[PDB]
Design a protein around this nucleic acid. Structure first.
Lengths: 92, 124, 74, 90
RNA sequence: GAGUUGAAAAUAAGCAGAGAUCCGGAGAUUCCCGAAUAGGUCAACCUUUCGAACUUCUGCUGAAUCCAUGGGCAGGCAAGAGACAACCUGGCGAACUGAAACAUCUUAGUAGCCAGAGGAAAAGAAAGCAAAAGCGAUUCCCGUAGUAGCGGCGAGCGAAAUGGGAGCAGCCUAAACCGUGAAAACGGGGUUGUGGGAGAGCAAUACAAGCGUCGUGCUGCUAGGCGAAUCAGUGGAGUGCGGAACCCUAGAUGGUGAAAGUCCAGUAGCCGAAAGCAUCACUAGCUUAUGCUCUGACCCGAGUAGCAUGGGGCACGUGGAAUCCCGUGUGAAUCAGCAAGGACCACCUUGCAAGGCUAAAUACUCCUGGGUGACCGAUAGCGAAGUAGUACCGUGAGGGA
RNA sequence: AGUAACGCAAACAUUGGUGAGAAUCCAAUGCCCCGAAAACCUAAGGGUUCCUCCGCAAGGUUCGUCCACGGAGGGUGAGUCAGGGCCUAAGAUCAGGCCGAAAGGCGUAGUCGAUGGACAACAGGUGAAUAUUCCUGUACUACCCCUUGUUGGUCCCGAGG
RNA sequence: GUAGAGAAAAUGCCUCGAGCCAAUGUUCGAGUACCAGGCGCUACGGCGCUGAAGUAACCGAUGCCAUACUCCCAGGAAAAGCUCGAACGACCUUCAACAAAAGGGUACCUGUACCCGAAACCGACACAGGUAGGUAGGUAGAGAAUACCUAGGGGCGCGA
């Protein structure tokens, strides 16, 4: 059997995007975009929940904790997909 | 103002049982604005107070805008207590108490205890 | 513990008295000594920690009824 | 507004509808973050309806007759394999 | 039965006279830590073969060792762990103090510490008190009584019996004997005291009472419902005052601009439960079971009682020191007996230890639901009427507004 | 009592700017100080003090337009760096085992336990707050797939290191 | 290579190998980078285009070789990773397992700000005190003392 490290309610593993101006800097400059996830999350569970719900090959998943408690995730997509054409569809 | 906040048994506020519904014609019994009829507008169950139309006059001053313009003076009603009002039928002009008649169907309706008509309004 | 499993003999809280009636505590306890007694239902020695009164039972009454009186044999 | 249809639907379409309403709830989180015009009441009855769905599913766990910890092992034995899928509203 | 999405306003959208919000009964979820329990852990995390780990129970396989034991594997809604203010029981157990010092003694078997357990616990059904008269398990209260005593006869400690009340309830088991098995057990019998039981024989049948998933019964509780009777004048406001009326099976209370029988919520009274719990009363049913005569043989709880010692505790400090329980060592008798009646002996009286279980009266408050208060009113009353065991201090125990 | 003091005797001065208000905030020019630091980075600790804007009620031993202060928002990106997914020392906990009024004491296997042993990334740029972490270049680890052979392989055990 | 119960190892015997070891070094990485300068506007805070030489020698490290040698007694951790290997023991077996050769794919949690010879840590203070470790420029000097300075950072939060 292929167990994950922790079973963590995968339709709630992502919470909200970040709409700061530096996030748009990461879109136009990095082909990346910014999500807010819960602390109980992975570079294997978030990375699977982007290539399925969105339909995009994700390059890397750079995560960090934020001292108010919640977790911040810079997800960088592949070169084949612009983050600007996939972020205006959501509302960025 | 902690001396006047709502009491909360099991996180929900204790709501009072009263005798005035919306759309009723109340009379002010004693306090202040004595002896004038009126509809009620908005209801406040925790204070047991009721705001009624076009009688209680509280001329309040409001800073209107954020640009500092026109600063309007708005004349707004306040809360008179629910024990200071009675109900009124427009056929017999007399302020009367309440009563709960159980009619032929299952429903139980209000009743002016001195006259013979029903306070209770249908679905419209 | 300083108890015998067969007969429930424990220590005795019993003061000692000098000539001028001074009393210390002197916890007084039984001679429950190490032995290794033969067992007829297995024809073999068991290693036990027996008080001497319990020794007089297992030689007088036999080890079977004493060990079933305590409840334990293995 | 009575939800009479939930005790009519079988367990597979029940569970698939749970996953669809959770996905629509995540779309309501994206539309709430996007500041597009949204209904917060739908954000209420979405999760509030998934509560109804899991009460009916858990009653169906009850009338077979199994333990609470067997429902823990069965439920967590199911939650480990949920491939994410977007809702059919496109 | 009419508005709601807590405090807590505002804003955006809802939910609702095919009955929302809310209340009550029974259920569901309950991330992570914490008995914490898959393993580790620096609690609320990490690693995961996603696991009730360990002990106990059941089942299989069954080491040194033949039977065993240990181990391993498995099952299991799976019994225990952990928490609990005070009371209760069991064990360790002081010292300051009092004696005008202090060691015997007291404080004190109190505090404290550990363990356990219930709404009560312990004890409890006479090997008992008593005195020639009598009582009939245990517990608690008043009393005897500050008496008899005990005590460097100092300081102090201090019963018990007779009497009066609360509450009452008594039952299972071993042995002698029959039957099955190598014992060990099992099934019948018997469990009592101015003695029974076993063995042998004769009679004789049903009155009364005890226990109880199960469901109809009753009241009570956890939501509630109806519920009597007035206006007007007065300096902000009237419930107060003055004038006119009424209710009362309701004049308890709280509020309402201001103090209320007639304004509201209510109250007196009458009602009301789908669901759960509790109270006693039914029920298929299990049970208790009887009387006489002969028979001193057989039995009536053994390393036990007693004794020599070392003690402890009974108010009794080793004293004439009995009763009760233990440490070492010795070590009985079965009813024609044994133990107690304050060393001990003789007679009489009383009871039958060395096997267990029991409700009530009883002690207390972390509390809960009612009713009160010659109790407080922000230096008071709980430490705490707001963030209260909070800010703050300490490494921590802890202190603390 | 409006008294001592205002926390080294490195030392500031002027011109402009901002404002209602400037010895103190900013900018420039000189002057002066540390320079095995009074420089830069990381271990510990602290916990948001870091950055933009706003404010000057309290704090700053003066003032203040400034602030490690108050309010709102943001910021900490790792296969390679440091720990864990590896290992053990001191030490701790110790299954069974011995002991002990209780609690627990001793002690073996085992398991934790870095201050050590093992293991793979450097240079330039970006940037109000991040850089061996983000971008670009060249690399290196640990597994899978793609081609040749092998029927045995993994772990425990024996040894070198 | 053998020999003994002897797979590896260890010990004993025999044989082949004159070289070996490691900092440093040349090239690629690596220049259509960086860089002095000039060229055009200032929100005058900087951006924009172009770009020369980029070598040699003397000193010389407390850094490497280097757990390299010499000397001494006071005699200098453990286990895993790694490498080699028979029997015994548990499991899986053929397109399964093992060992490589190029080429692609994949990349586990926590810490990452800021102060850290301190105004933010510890001394109740924005306290003349304390705090492990790393980098060690020039001149005069034996020197990490000292005196003055580059980089970088300040003028010590009352003044007259």
């Amino acid at each position: 059997l292929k167990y994950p490290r922790r079973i963590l309610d995968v339709y709630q593993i992502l919470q909200s995007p970040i709409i700061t101006e530096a996030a748009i800097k990461n879109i136009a400059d990095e082909n990346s975009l910014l999500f807010t996830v819960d602390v109980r999350a992975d570079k294997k569970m978030i990375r699977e929940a982007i290539s399925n719900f969105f339909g995009v090959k994700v390059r890397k998943v750079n995560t960090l904790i934020r001292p108010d408690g919640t977790k911040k995730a810079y997800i960088m997509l592949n070169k084949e997909y612009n983050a600007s054409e996939l972020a205006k569809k959501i509302g960025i | 103002r902690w001396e006047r906040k709502d009491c909360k048994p099991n996180s929900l506020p204790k709501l009072h049982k009263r005798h005035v519904k919306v759309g009723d014609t109340v009379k002010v019994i004693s306090g202040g604005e004595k002896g004038k009829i009126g509809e009620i507008s908005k209801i406040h169950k925790h204070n047991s107070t009721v705001i009624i139309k076009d009688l209680n006059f509280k001329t309040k001053h409001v800073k209107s805008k954020e640009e500092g313009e026109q600063g309007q003076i708005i004349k707004i009603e306040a809360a008179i207590h629910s024990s200071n009002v009675m109900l009124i039928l427009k056929e017999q002009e007399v302020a009367d108490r309440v009563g709960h008649k159980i009619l032929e169907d299952v429903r139980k309706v209000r009743y002016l205890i001195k006259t013979g008509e029903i306070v209770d309004t249908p679905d419209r | 513990r300083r108890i015998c499993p067969f007969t429930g003999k424990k220590s005795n809280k019993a003061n000692r008295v000098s000539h001028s009636n001074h009393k210390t505590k002197r916890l007084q306890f039984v001679n429950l000594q190490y032995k290794r007694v033969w067992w007829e239902a297995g024809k073999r020695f068991v290693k036990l920690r027996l008080s001497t009164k319990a020794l007089k039972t297992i030689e007088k009454n036999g080890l079977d009824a004493v060990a079933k009186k305590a409840g334990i044999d293995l | 507004d009575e939800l009479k249809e939930l005790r009519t639907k079988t367990n597979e379409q029940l569970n698939e509808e749970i996953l669809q309403l959770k996905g629509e709830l995540f779309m309501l989180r994206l539309q709430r973050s996007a500041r597009e015009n949204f209904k917060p009441s739908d954000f209420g009855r979405m999760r509030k309806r998934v509560a109804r769905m899991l009460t009916v599913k858990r009653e169906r766990e009850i009338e077979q007759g199994v333990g609470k910890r067997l429902s823990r092992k069965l439920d967590k034995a199911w939650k480990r394999s949920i491939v994410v899928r977007p809702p059919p509203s496109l």
